[PDB]
Ligand binder design. Structure first.
Ligand SMILES: CC(C)C(=O)C(=O)O
Ligand SMILES: CC(C)C(=O)C(=O)O
Ligand SMILES: CC(C)C(=O)C(=O)O
Ligand SMILES: CC(C)C(=O)C(=O)O
Ligand code: NA
Ligand code: NA
Ligand code: NA
Ligand code: NA
Lengths: 249, 250, 262, 246, 262
């Protein structure tokens, strides 16, 4: 029942697409879990969607731990992934370990960190100590104010033992090559359907914000009269390989 | 008084060491009076005492508190305290600070989880007067995250000066080889009978949880009239080498 | 509309001068944004202009964070650059990162640090982790007691060292290099050599942009302004007109004039 | 007058035995000072004698600073030596320095640390920064829960690092003798024989405050006298006459 | 007017003796500044003259910052030098920097640290980051318990070690090198060898300047002062005049006299 890293490995081998959605509260976490969502991402994207800030930089380790605890009270079988917030882990591998440990004590089953080859040593340090790491490469929103290289980043984390490699806004053809090159499962957002799974910010896919949605995002609320049905459709289109479509790439 | 030297003599003589977890003073005095030689204040208290789903949320404060409670009840038995998740893996210096607090709380030895990558930490602590029990094989703090590696882990800790090597859920024949290879006494749980001693979580062996006991666990309460007799039977079986039996091994 | 690092790079390539001014409050930040200031510098110069102290050394990270938040609530399109205060970042690249992360969480889009080649590793450490860096070379006011005051840099055989400081920061990935009190001809060479945009104060008009302390250019202090500073309030009808004349003279390359250059 | 490291060096050179005793309070420290005790050791042994614990490991840095302050208000001429408590200085030489600096600020004139060769770097670090160090080798109570050439190596490494004094506990007398003869600094012993430049005893032990058999290498000096003052003076006289340890 | 490092360098080259005195309060600081004292030393000597302790070791960084602030409210032209107190800087160059930064934030224009060649790296770390350093060599009072009291330095084969200490600091960028209780002939050779000004106390008249503890030179203690100290209060009936006499004798090279030199 419970989704573990082995489960994700089996899904990658079986070619069965993984469904990930961000979650910041207990009620929505339980709803998504029950709707088939396999990975619950307590992302630092909550700085915009929950806190209403202009970027994710101000989110603190305290905020991430609080939301992790909330989500942990609602989740059952889904795996809880928590982001390491800006400033809380890039100082050193030792600082990253301390911040990751706090998230794990709050209820996370894996942590997500941003960065390329320069973060590979941090991934290894954490994974060796029992903390599953999700390496976030490509577009890394914490550096918002700031092909071979992406492949290198991917490989570096894989070699260090990252459990999952997540790619944001990447040429679909490159995401495909990456997914085939790394031993660990991959998760995409604006990276195509050749990844081992997909992720989207709940709020975006529920159409909580006015005006058009990002190009790589699909509104799943539309056509449904219940949030649970909207999420179920997401899981199904992810697995059907219908999402992302050609328009979302 | 049970000391490291006592354990060493027992290994050399083939006399099995009886270890049991303990998180409270009353149970600790009872186990001590019932012949338990090593009291393990383990982070297993996150599940048995705190009721969590894992031992990761256990803090250093929690370990020091439980160690202090056990220390008020213990007499002859050695107190072993676990370094909790996040409090010692950052560096050897951080592990020494955390272990120093546990020793200050009443521990006579500390236990830490990890393979070869933690051996340098074992050496740093042992050289500074802090006896270390290196816990290898199935390390519960890594639940969310292979025969030769285990052997490598055991050798590295032994060479680093580990006072004791504890193995959890390890193929029996592998455990026997490790035990015959390292110089320090070995303790097992789900590791077979060829270790120098055994450990079990108190509540498990007392049948506190409903349902079937884990495979490597035996209910010692059953067939006895008191907690005292259940514990004495556990100690007597470990020493008679009747526990664990074929049915409790992998 | 929003001013980003790419905007500055496009302006350097086009030869359009960048207008930077200091800002420590929300109302003045909004006034300057509306008057066309592109970069709003929350400088540690507030230790003197706001706090009334004799130098910028006593300014703390908390003071820097507070003013940054204030300015962030008034800014609109302009980029916010916040100074890393004395004592909060020179201890190590790790300490600099932590201090810079607090400023970015306070609302900064870039941080400014003082120092030559010995700070380039710090610049690299921060930029690689998403924190845009402005390297400030030449006369660095946090080292005022070591310099003994405000002297022009790059004289004689000191030119190479300044050039070396600029290069190390640029190679370390500095987004912008800021020069203060530097021989104009040297600043021109530096600007023509580094890949990143440059900003000057008392560095001549051949930098890719200019900066002035608000209070200096508004003639808030009694007496005369420094030689490299022009009083724009004087001869103008409002604070809004004074700032607009500054941005216009910077873009027309009339400020700094010959009188304001070393 | 005042007892300085120079005083101790001169005493070793002349063969005049040094009297050291533990002290954790102001009143007893002033009494011992007046009785001729030259070195007052504020030891982590207070964890057992004062606090009543089973070991000295739980003694904290705050406890050592407190007792150091108390003793410093009683002491006049004697040198105050303060122990660096378990867990407060073994993390690194930088940590030891911060802990030693707190003890010096509380009134100590020298600090004592436990450990062989692996602690010599720490000794060098502290001594180079003005903190006199007493290196404690042999039996080190802080490692209670956890050979001739090893002892000599430890003593030599500490002496080469600049230790002001080397303290030996429970060492074969003949071996203590060689160490004393080979190091440039004064040596102090406890259960180390009379061939040391000086002796130390825990005050409560030599005053017979503990119920039970007197420790083997300890002599009860309270016996035969009717004042604590006379008991201390007798210990100092026997140490000087080289009749203790017997 | 305003005393800077450049001023001290100009005086060394000119042969004009620098007058330094300790100061722990604002009133006395203003008086000395008005009497011509060029360097006001907020020394850890306040542990004995102000706090009444037996040594300067118990003085904390907080104490140093507090007195530094007091002195800064009275100082006008004089340069404020603050001592780094025992335990606050010897742990590492990084810790020395953090402590030195607090002193500078409290009002100091330079910090003073005790130590030989082993502290030179710390000297370099500080000066490069804008903190002027006065290296104190010879008899370093924070090491009094290791020293076994106060004793003359530099005789025999120890002379070369002292020279090394001074040159190591001079090479690291020390702004000033202070010598306490060193053979006069050695102090002279060191003064003629390093590039920075030198200040002495019990080091002869050939240093570039002198320093005394205020309370010692005002005769505040009972009995006699050390051999290298002179009571300037005697023969005068105002502290103003007593301080002016110190300044005059230092500049005339009449103090220290033969009787105050080793
Ligand atoms: C877009 C996803 C991967 C994310 O980083 C977040 O929600 O924080
Ligand atoms: C039983 C042993 C393996 C243990 O770690 C614990 O109780 O925490
Ligand atoms: C650009 C200059 C004037 C500066 O550093 C400041 O204002 O803080
Ligand atoms: C006498 C001078 C050099 C001093 O160190 C002090 O006052 O602290
Ligand atoms: Na994120
Ligand atoms: Na455990
Ligand atoms: Na500035
Ligand atoms: Na001083």
């Amino acid at each position: 029942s419970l989704i573990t890293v082995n489960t994700l490995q089996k899904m990658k081998a079986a070619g069965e697409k993984i469904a990930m959605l961000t979650a910041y509260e207990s009620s929505f976490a339980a709803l998504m879990d029950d709707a088939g969502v396999e990975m619950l991402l307590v992302g630092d994207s909550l700085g915009m969607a929950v806190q209403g800030r202009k970027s994710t930089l101000p989110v603190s380790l305290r905020d991430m731990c609080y939301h992790t605890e909330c989500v942990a009270r609602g989740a059952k079988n889904a795996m809880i992934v928590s982001d390491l917030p800006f400033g809380a882990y890039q100082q050193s591998k030792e600082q990253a370990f301390a911040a990751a440990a706090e998230l794990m004590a709050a209820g996370a089953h894996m942590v997500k960190l941003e960065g390329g080859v320069w973060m590979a040593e941090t991934t290894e340090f954490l994974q060796m100590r029992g903390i599953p790491v999700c390496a976030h490469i490509g577009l890394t929103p914490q550096s918002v104010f700031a092909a071979q290289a992406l492949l290198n980043d991917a490989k570096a984390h894989d070699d260090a033992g990252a459990a999952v490699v997540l790619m944001e806004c990447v040429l679909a053809e490159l995401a495909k090559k990456v997914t085939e090159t790394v031993s660990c499962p991959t998760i995409g957002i604006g990276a195509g359907a050749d990844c081992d799974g997909q992720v989207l910010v709940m709020h975006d896919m529920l159409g909580i914000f006015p005006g058009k949605t990002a190009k790589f995002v699909k509104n799943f609320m539309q056509g449904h009269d219940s949030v649970q049905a909207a999420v179920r459709a997401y899981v199904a289109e992810v697995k059907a390989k219908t999402f992302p479509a050609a328009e979302h790439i």
